[PDB]
């Protein structure tokens, strides 16, 4: 447990120092692709649960 949490704290600190590894253009590619998928799938967003909800 102690070792694992150490290397953990290491990886967090290295993720803050070294910045996001996903770069940028890649991330845009992901977001865009997902957008196209949900588009062709007619998926309507899930709204917030209303105060009156019978279920």
């Amino acid at each position: 447990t102690r070792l694992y949490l150490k290397a953990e704290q290491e990886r967090q600190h290295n993720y803050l120092k070294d910045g996001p590894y996903i770069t940028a253009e890649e991330a845009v590619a992901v977001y865009t692709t997902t957008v196209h998928w949900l588009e062709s799938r007619r998926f309507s967003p899930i709204p917030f649960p209303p105060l009156s909800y019978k279920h």
Binding site: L16, K17, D18, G19, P20, I22, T23, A24, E25, A27, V28, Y31
Partner: peptide
């Protein structure tokens, strides 16, 4: 004086990268 030793009174007994900006603004 140099060899004064701080008493070891016992307690038992951060920076950020700017790439986050480029990413977040990109998204």
């Amino acid at each position: 004086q140099e060899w004064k030793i701080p008493p070891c009174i016992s307690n038992w007994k951060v920076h950020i990268n700017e790439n986050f900006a480029k990413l977040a603004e990109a998204l």
